Structure formats: C-alpha cells, structure tokens
C-alpha cells in the first residue's frame, strides 16, 4: 500500500560443512 | 599410536573441504576482478 512489506533484507552467504567422504583404502 | 598412522596411510581422501569451495568448472576471476575495477571506475 503506502509502503511495502517490511524485511531484514540481507544478502547472506552459507557455508558447506566438512564432507567426510567414506574412505578409500 | 600405530593404529593412527596405520589407518591414515592406507585410506585416501578424494573429497576435502577446500575444493568444495573451488568450482569443478573453470571460472577465473579476471572477469570478476575486471568488474571489480569497473565499479572502482564508478568510484
């Protein structure tokens, strides 16, 4: 309407964690 | 102990942390650094 919907707009950035692939003998 | 070196030698790591961040294609950063300098040309 008079103004848009409110948001805490952030261009965030995530991180992958440690994979732990099953090991290869 | 002997078990530690005994296992970490014989296994293999094909999947680490760092090359997850690195992309499997070849995306260089000159294009990235060129537009980095280009926005500095607006500055």
From Swiss-Prot, chain A:
Cell compartment(s), UniProt: Nucleus
Highest taxon, organism lineage: Eukaryota
Segments passing through the bilayer: none
Family according to the record: Belongs to the PAF1 family.
Role played: Component of the PAF1 complex (PAF1C) which has multiple functions during transcription by RNA polymerase II and is implicated in regulation of development and maintenance of embryonic stem cell pluripotency. PAF1C associates with RNA polymerase II through interaction with POLR2A CTD non-phosphorylated and 'Ser-2'- and 'Ser-5'-phosphorylated forms and is involved in transcriptional elongation, acting both independently and synergistically with TCEA1 and in cooperation with the DSIF complex and HTATSF1. PAF1C is required for transcription of Hox and Wnt target genes.
Binding partners and assembly: Component of the PAF1 complex, which consists of CDC73, PAF1, LEO1, CTR9, RTF1 and SKIC8. The PAF1 complex interacts with PHF5A. Interacts with POLR2A, TCEA1, SKIC3, KMT2A/MLL1, SUPT5H, RNF20 and RNF40. Interacts with UBE2E1. Interacts with PINT87aa which is encoded by the circular form of the long non-coding RNA LINC-PINT; the interaction enhances the binding of the PAF1 complex to target gene promoters and may anchor the complex on target gene promoters, sequentially pausing RNA polymerase II-induced mRNA elongation.
Protein's UniProt name: RNA polymerase II-associated factor 1 homolog
Organism: Homo sapiens
Included stretch of the parent chain: 25 to 49 of 531
UniProtKB/Swiss-Prot annotation, chain B:
Functional note: Tumor suppressor probably involved in transcriptional and post-transcriptional control pathways. May be involved in cell cycle progression through the regulation of cyclin D1/PRAD1 expression. Component of the PAF1 complex (PAF1C) which has multiple functions during transcription by RNA polymerase II and is implicated in regulation of development and maintenance of embryonic stem cell pluripotency.
Posttranslational mods: Phosphorylated. Dephosphorylated by PTPN11.
Subcellular location as annotated: Nucleus
Ranges for region Interaction with CTNNB1: 1-33
Portion of the full sequence shown: 218 to 260 of 531
UniProt disease annotation: Hyperparathyroidism 1: An autosomal dominant disorder characterized by hypercalcemia, elevated parathyroid hormone (PTH) levels, and uniglandular or multiglandular parathyroid hyperplasia, adenomas, and carcinomas.
Species annotation: Homo sapiens
Residues in the signal sequence: none
Family note: Belongs to the CDC73 family.
UniProt protein name: Parafibromin
Assembly and interaction partners: Component of the PAF1 complex, which consists of CDC73, PAF1, LEO1, CTR9, RTF1 and SKIC8. The PAF1 complex interacts with PHF5A. Within the PAF1 complex interacts directly with PHF5A. Interacts with POLR2A, CPSF1, CPSF4, CSTF2, KMT2A/MLL1 and CTNNB1. Interacts with a Set1-like complex that has histone methyltransferase activity and methylates histone H3. Found in a complex with BCL9L or BCL9, CDC73, CTNNB1 and PYGO1 indicative for the participation in a nuclear Wnt signaling complex. Interacts with PTPN11. Interacts with SETD5. (Microbial infection) The PAF1 complex interacts with Zika virus French Polynesia 10087PF/2013 non-structural protein 5/NS5. The interaction with viral NS5 proteins may reduce the antiviral immune response by inhibiting the recruitment of the PAF1 complex to interferon-stimulated genes, thus preventing their transcription.
Expression across tissues: Found in adrenal and parathyroid glands, kidney and heart.
């Amino acid at each position: 309407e008079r103004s848009g919907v409110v948001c805490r707009v952030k261009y965030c950035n995530s991180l992958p964690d440690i994979p732990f692939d099953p090991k290869f003998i | 102990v002997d078990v530690t070196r005994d296992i970490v030698s014989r296994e293999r790591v094909w999947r680490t942390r760092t090359t997850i961040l690195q992309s499997t294609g070849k995306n260089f950063s000159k294009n990235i650094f060129a537009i980095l300098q280009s926005v500095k040309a607006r500055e």
